[PDB]
Every structure is written in C-alpha cells, then in structure tokens.
Design a protein around this nucleic acid. Structure first.
Ligand SMILES: [Cl-]
Ligand SMILES: [Cl-]
Ligand SMILES: [Mg+2]
Ligand SMILES: [Mg+2]
Ligand SMILES: [Mg+2]
Ligand SMILES: [Mg+2]
Ligand SMILES: [Mg+2]
Lengths: 144, 150, 146, 144, 144, 144, 144
RNA sequence: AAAAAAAAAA
RNA sequence: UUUUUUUUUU
RNA sequence: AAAAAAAAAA
RNA sequence: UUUUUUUUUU
RNA sequence: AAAAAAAAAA
RNA sequence: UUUUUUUUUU
RNA sequence: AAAAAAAAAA
RNA sequence: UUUUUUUUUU
RNA sequence: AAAAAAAAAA
RNA sequence: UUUUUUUUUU
RNA sequence: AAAAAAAAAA
RNA sequence: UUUUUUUUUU
RNA sequence: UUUUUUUUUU
RNA sequence: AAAAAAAAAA
C-alpha cells in the first residue's frame, strides 16, 4: 500500500450532516427495591458518559437486564422486565432467574418494528423488578 | 431480504446469557464539515481542535485519527479570476511540502482538491495540533475531514 | 419416541426464561348497537373483557377489522356497512363499504392496518367509525393483546 | 409493503369462539417441608397472575421442577416428583440432584397421551419432595 | 381492439370506497429568514391547490428541499433539514450546498417505516434553514 | 430495515405537478322512475364526497349498474343501460335481470378507446332504466 | 398505429348486399295462464324493438325459457316447453323447476340441424306452460 | 379455445 | 389464417 | 433499434 | 420487408 | 487495464 | 512479472 | 428443522 | 403450504 | 455469513 | 458490491 | 426492472 | 400474474 | 426386523 | 444410532 500522501480528485461539494444518528448499546445501572417496580427513565440514555448528551430523542430496539448485586440469603437471583409504551403499556413480565446463587440473573425483550418510535428524557422504557438491589441494563438503541 | 419478511407485531423475549463486554464511550468514524477563513497570499494552518465540538457531537473526544481531507472554496473568487484551493499536509513527525491543488474551470464554480493520509501516518492528533495548511484566492474554504474519533 | 403408555422422566436442566403474563394473538367477536345512518365510534375497551379471557390486558395492537351487519335492513333496502379507520396520530377519511346483494344476507367489509400504523391502543381509544342502515353490527377484530 | 390501510373483501360471517384454548408454560413456586411430600394443587394454575382465571379445567402435558432456595448445610439440593392421577396414583419418584452446592437440582416428567385428561382446581398434579424449603415449577399444559 | 361499446357481465355488488387513499409528491414553497429555522407545518399539504383538502391526515415518507431564490452576494446556496417527530424531535441537520453560485442547493431525508405514522394540520414536518429567502419542498406522502 | 432517518442525495429540481390525474371507481346512486329513462349526469362524478371537486373533466372508461331497492311485488329486478355520447347517442340497451326476487339485477358496458374523450358536468353518461326506484352505479373513469 | 387518414388502394367494385342476415339472441316475454299452454308466435321476433322489422323469415336454432313472475303461494316455479314444427309437432315437455321459491325456473331445447328451416310471423315456435303468469324467452335464431 | 353469421386483414 | 361485432359451444 | 406520416423498392 | 425524408420513442 | 521514469520484490 | 511513487494513455 | 394450540394467507 | 404469537421436540 | 447506522471505495 | 467503525442476528 | 397506493384484467 | 394512473427505488 | 418400558454405550 | 433385560408386532 502507499507510504505517502496522495492526491484526491474531489468533485462537487457533497451532502453533509454534522449531527448524524448513532446505533449504540448503552450500559447503565439502576437501583431496585424489594417488591417495588422501578420505572427506567429514557433520560438515563442521554449523558456525556455515553457521548450522547447532544441527542434528545432515541429509538430503543431491545432491552437486556442483569442483576448487578448478590441476592438475599438462601435465594437465587431473579429479574423481570415489563415494557412500557406511550401508546399503551404492556403487562408482560419477562423473567430470568439464576441457577447458581453466585451467578447473575438475566433476561431481555425485543421491540417489534411497529413499536420502534422515538422517546425523550421524560419517557420511561420499562419497569424492572428484582430481589437484588441493583440491575445492570444494556439497551440497544438508535440515537437521533 | 425484507421481502415480505419483517418480524412480529409484539414484544418478544430474549434469552440473554452472561453479562457481555461493554464500552460506554466507543469510537466513531466520521466526516466533519466545517469552514475556515483564509487570506490572500497567506497559508492558514487548520487546527485539529475544530473537530472537537458539540456542533459535531464530538466534544467528549480528545483525540482523532485523520484519514483524508477534502477542501472546497466557500466564497466567490476575485474579479476576473477562477477559484483555486491548495492543501499542504502537516504532521507532528514532519510536515510535508506537497501543495495539492484544484482550480475551477467556471468562475462561478467552486475549486476543490483533497489528499489521503497513508496508513503509516495515521496516528492521533489533539486540539493543539494542525491538520494542513490551506491557500486560496477565496476568503473562505469548506473542509470535509474523514477521521476516526477515539 | 411416541406411543409411550407411561410417564417418562425429563432430564431437565437450568431454570428457563419464563413469563407468567404473555401476549395473545386473537380474533375477537363482539357487537355494537347502531342507529340509522349515524356513525358510531367503536371503543377499544370492548376488546378487554372476561368474556374474551382478556380482562388482564390493558393494551392491544389491532391488525385488521372486519364488520358484518347483524340485524335486517330497513324495508325495501339491501344491507350496507361502512368502516372509517381511526388513529391517535390522525384519523382516516376512508369509508370502506360493503353492501348485500340479497336483501336477506349480511353486508360485510374490512380493512387491514399497515405495519407502520400498528401501535397500541387502550380502553379509552376508539378503533373505527361504523355506519350502517341496520341497527347492529357484528365485528371480528384480529389483534395482538400485550 | 403497504404504508396505508387497505380494503379487506370480507365474505360470510366466519365461525368464532370468544373463549378459546391456550397452550401455556406456567411458572409458580410451592412450599416444601423436610421429609414430607407436598401435593401440588391444580387450582394454582387458574389465576389472573397467569391470565387464566377464566379457565376451570386444564390438561397437563409435562411437569418440570427446580429447587428454589439453598439446601441445608453440607448438602447438595435434591427434588423428587411423584405423578398423581385421578384414575390411579403412580409410585415413581423421578429425582434430580445438584452436583454443586450453589446450584439448583432439577427433574421433570412427561405425561403420555393416554393420560392427558382434564383436571380441575380440587385435583392434584403431583407430589414434590425436597431438602429445600421451596420448589419452582414450570408446568406445560393446555387450558380449556 | 373494439370500436363499439361492449357488454360487461357484472356480478354481485363489489366492495366500494368513495374516499380512497392517495400517494403523492406535493410541491410547495416556504419563506426562510437568515439564521432562523422555519418549522414546516403539515397543514400546508391539505390544500385545494393539491386536490387534497378532503384529507385531514397524511403519512410522510420522504422530504426533499431546493433553494428557491438566489443566495447572498459572494455566497453559494445552502439548505438544511432537521426532521421533526411527535414522539421525539431529531437533531440531524441534513445539508446540501451549491457548487455553482447560480444553481440551487438540494437535500432530502427518508423517514423509516417504523416512524411512518400520521400527521395532522397542527403538526410540523421538519425545520428548514438556508441562506436563501425561499426554499422549495417536494414531499412524498400518503394521504389517508 | 433502517430504524432511523437517512439522507437523500437529491439532485436538480424535478418536473412537478400539484394537480395530477386520478383513475377511480366512483360509487353513487340515482333515482329511477317506472317506464322512464334517467339520464345520468357527469356532474355526479365531481364532488367533495369523492375527493374530486377540484376536477372539471373526466374520461369514462366503463359503467356498471346494480338495482338498489327491491322490485315491485311479484317481479324480478331488472336494469338497463343506454350509452350516451356527445358525438352521437347509442341505442343499445344492455340489460341484466335478477333470478332471485331478493337479489340485485346488474349489468355494465365498456367504452372503446376511440370513444374515450372528456365529459364535463353538463354532459350525461348514459340512460338508466329499471323497475326498482334506485340504481347503484360504479363508474370507472380517469379524472383529469 | 396511424393518427391520420390514410389512402386505400381500392380495386374493382365488390359484391355487396344491403340487407344481410343476422345471428341473434332475442329476449321477450309472454303471458301464461294456469293450466293452459301458450303458443309462442314467431311474429314476436320481428320488431323494431329488436332491429328486425325488415325481416320476414327466421331460422330458430334454440329456445330457452325462464319464469318471469313469482309462483303461487306454497309452490316452486316451473316452466315447460313443447317444440312445434310445421312438418309435425313434437310431444316433448322439457321442464325445469326452481329449488328455491324465490328463484326462476328455467329450461331450453335445441333444434337439430335437419329441422332448422324458416318460419314466418303466422308460425308458432313452441308451447309454454308454467305456474307463473309470465315467462321470459331468449331465442337464438338466424334472421334472413 | 374452436365454430357459425356481418366486417376488416392476408 | 389473425383480429373486431352478434351468436354458440367449452 | 422499432414504430407513425410522405416517397421509393421488393 | 430494406432504404430516403419528417416525427417519436430508446 | 497497459506502458514509460524512480524504488522495492521476484 | 507483481506492487508503491510521478506521468501518460484508456 | 418438524409438530400442537390461537391468528393471518393461500 | 408459508409466516406471526404461545408451547414442544431437535 | 447477512443485515441496519456512520465512513470509504467502486 | 467489498472493506473499516458501532449494533444485531447466526 | 421490481415494489407501494387507485383502477382494470386473469 | 400483465397493463393504465400517482409514487419510489434502479 | 420396527416400536414401547428399564439399562448401556455413542 | 446400536446393543442387553421385559413387552408388543411382524
Ligand atoms: Cl420470581
Ligand atoms: Cl434547523
Ligand atoms: Mg445477582
Ligand atoms: Mg500547488
Ligand atoms: Mg343484515
Ligand atoms: Mg437449591
Ligand atoms: Mg447558489
């Protein structure tokens, strides 16, 4: 391959876009109380910590969750996810459980194409329930 | 694919496994468009700092690997003249003396030119570094720089 | 293999992913009472009921609507039925219509909702507007409860 | 594909059923005591918690069981299942044991076609024995 | 081919629809001020000038823009489009520039299927910016 | 498929037309008297009820007709169509009859290409004859 | 194809015939009385209502008949056809009956080639019988 | 799809 | 032998 | 390259 | 059916 | 895609 | 004979 | 990848 | 017979 | 291995 | 249509 | 050249 | 599955 | 030689 | 997938 700078025969000025979209997998943690559902805010996805503070909307494609702290004594870890939608919240409770007390529980859900619209900071993605005090989420989304 | 394919109309369960490897602050390949002011008979040094800005969604980055530079005259040339733009590549390990140049063949049309950086000179640059020197008979140049933010 | 006559052991492994409250794709039949040449808005709430085993849902994604006249038409007339899709992001002005060709037979028509318009609806929402010369309309709605 | 609503050339009124059958995998837990067999009530399968409170009968196809809490000190988890049937109870004790003390024991059994009749709330599916105080069941069944 | 009227052996009364949908490419102009973004209202699409005043909703599919008047002295035309959505506005700025001062600048964006819902008069399609006092838009859409 | 907006690299301003043509199947009804031929006016085709009030001319391609009310006592329904043209009315009487007293009679005719010119509201498309007091018509035509 | 008038290189004067034959299906109705046969007169086929008043002879090929009014109370419609010939009348009574009281009864008969000679107005085609007060006939014939 | 009648073409 | 109109058979 | 209008040839 | 002229489409 | 000039390889 | 740099032709 | 239950299509 | 949802088997 | 987003090449 | 970056499915 | 909407035909 | 009208992609 | 039940090997 | 023990079939 070339070892030196070489000329580019550029033509006319192209179409440009200084603020393009970005497909991402955003990892973050939330605190969870015993017996209480936590509503995961969309605003958690906008932050300089993820290079995403210039975005104000996002299209979530899928949500995966893992317990992030150990479960109570004698128990195996569990985590549940209830998808929320601005046009109407769901009542599914997708749940994963651990089969070794020392291992994380995990589960996820995919959003169908027909339900992939934008959400903003004040929106909530889903409810989390767990017997562990923290849950780690990895959200696959399209910032725009 | 996607020929009548698509998927379901409802949320479905993912049988997730172990916690994956993750990175909250990944890299990003980009083409950044910005303009610079240039003066008659004077070479302007293009600062790398122009590439870090919220106007590009890149203010969380402190380094970038530049891969190629293209330039266009952004304002009209002087009376009776055709536009021209020249690019001289600059490197922290030793500046070049190439003067890549394009000129317009219609006075009403932009001049344009570019250069590609070879793999062996694709290291990082920071805000204090410069990308290239620009010369032109037009008072502004429009640059589109293809680069890897990291 | 098959044709075992007795219980047999399953070599179960790790606890699987589970969900006590899953989705359900359904064709729901219900009727609405209608007046003469008067549009009636069909409520989405008619889809949630113990009579359909769906009272545990609060949302549903409608995929298509079909409608039949349920009582006889006025004297000298053939039955007809009209459907005008309604949407929260913007109502339609289409009026899909069927008419009977025998005075003793039901009129029928339906419409399909495109993938890009298949979002959720709740009980307070309305599915469509119905218009008929008969006093009842029998609807069958294909939908995904979730 | 189409981006607008399209006509459906409906025909005669079809056959309908407002209350159809449902093939399900129902997850629920049962309490178990030391040295004592617990009879799992079929009524545990009818509940708004599973969207099944409008069913009063169910045809069980197979039963799988996992220990749901840690076992006593120095022991590995075990769980046994003895099928019950209204026409005659079995004496099999299908059993699984853990090989790591931190992991669940698991076993299941399949009901043959000739024994897949209906059960009601007052009936029992099986007996569960375990050294763990709780057992998690996932029962494959056809509600009707 | 036939030179006279011929008989049609009609059958039963078909399905009918007096107010059908309509896929269109609507052209209209908007005024733009220096350094100010103009919100393109969706209501502009329901006009007797387009045969569309019987519609109250539309599904937008793609937007294209051209500058419609000459740029300021010494400048080449430019135009920018920022898509707007009721579920969450975008921050993209798709931009084109003229490479000949005497020629229009042009650009567009396509709306993905998952974001192709309906819009009504009070909604806005996008934000337009340009150094020219007028921008010419052609909007591909489905009236319904 | 793509889940977010994408740039379109638009070119020169296209050829446009804000008021295009429209091929349509228009359903409407006319009253008919015993023993009297009813001239169907073309103006019936231009209406807000059809989204066609912006049109002043139309090219009719075919006409199909259905009896719309029940026939006289002891009679089977019939309907006849006589095509009319500005250059010369025809004398054909395309006719259909019901074979069940409770069923609609139907018939239609097709207009040859050499006779497919424009008609305006003052023109008449055909004469309708029937023993029922209303006839349902579906006219295939090209609005321009 | 050509859009202008074009020259025809005609030759010698051709054979001509200002009054040609015509193959036709003629539809008309006759009144029928209970228990009485009605002889269908051939003269009904020559009429300006059929464009055939310039003919005096016709070769009938086949006769189809349909009851034209409702039957008496409690009965299903029926119609019978007995062929009549100048060289010798037949004694066949071809018959159709309705299987639904609201539907027409129908039947026909074909005339063999060896019996396809001419008939004049004073001739009769066939006898019609029915429990309905009117019968609708469609006669396939060759006017000459 | 074939045939008969009128017409046109070859 | 193809097509157009009327008819018929399929 | 085909088609239409005029012409020429076959 | 080939060419020439006018037109049209590609 | 080939060729010529410098270089490198074979 | 292949590649890199400059050039040229296509 | 096949099957069973619900739906849709053919 | 294909797809979607639930289940199951592999 | 294919697809989606940004980029580059063709 | 290939490659690079992010993502996803396998 | 395929697809989507309206129409027509099969 | 072919064509016509609007649209889109190429 | 196929299948069902228990076992075993793979 | 084969084999061994019981059963059933051929
Ligand atoms: Cl749980
Ligand atoms: Cl803007
Ligand atoms: Mg844990
Ligand atoms: Mg230079
Ligand atoms: Mg009715
Ligand atoms: Mg345990
Ligand atoms: Mg310009």
């Amino acid at each position: 391959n070339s070892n030196v700078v070489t000329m580019i025969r550029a033509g006319s000025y192209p179409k440009v876009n200084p603020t393009p979209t970005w497909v991402r997998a955003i990892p973050f943690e939330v605190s969870v109380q015993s017996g209480i559902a936590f509503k995961v805010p969309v605003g958690s996805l906008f932050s300089a910590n993820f290079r995403t503070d210039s975005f104000t909307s996002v299209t979530v494609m899928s949500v995966r969750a893992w317990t992030q702290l150990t479960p109570p004594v004698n128990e195996y870890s569990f985590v549940r996810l209830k998808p929320l939608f601005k046009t109407g919240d769901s009542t599914e409770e997708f749940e994963g459980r651990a089969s070794n007390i020392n291992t994380r529980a995990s589960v996820g859900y995919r959003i169908p194409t027909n339900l992939r619209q934008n959400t903003v900071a004040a929106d909530n993605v889903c409810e989390v329930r767990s017997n562990c005090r923290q849950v780690a989420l990895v959200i696959s989304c399209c910032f725009n």
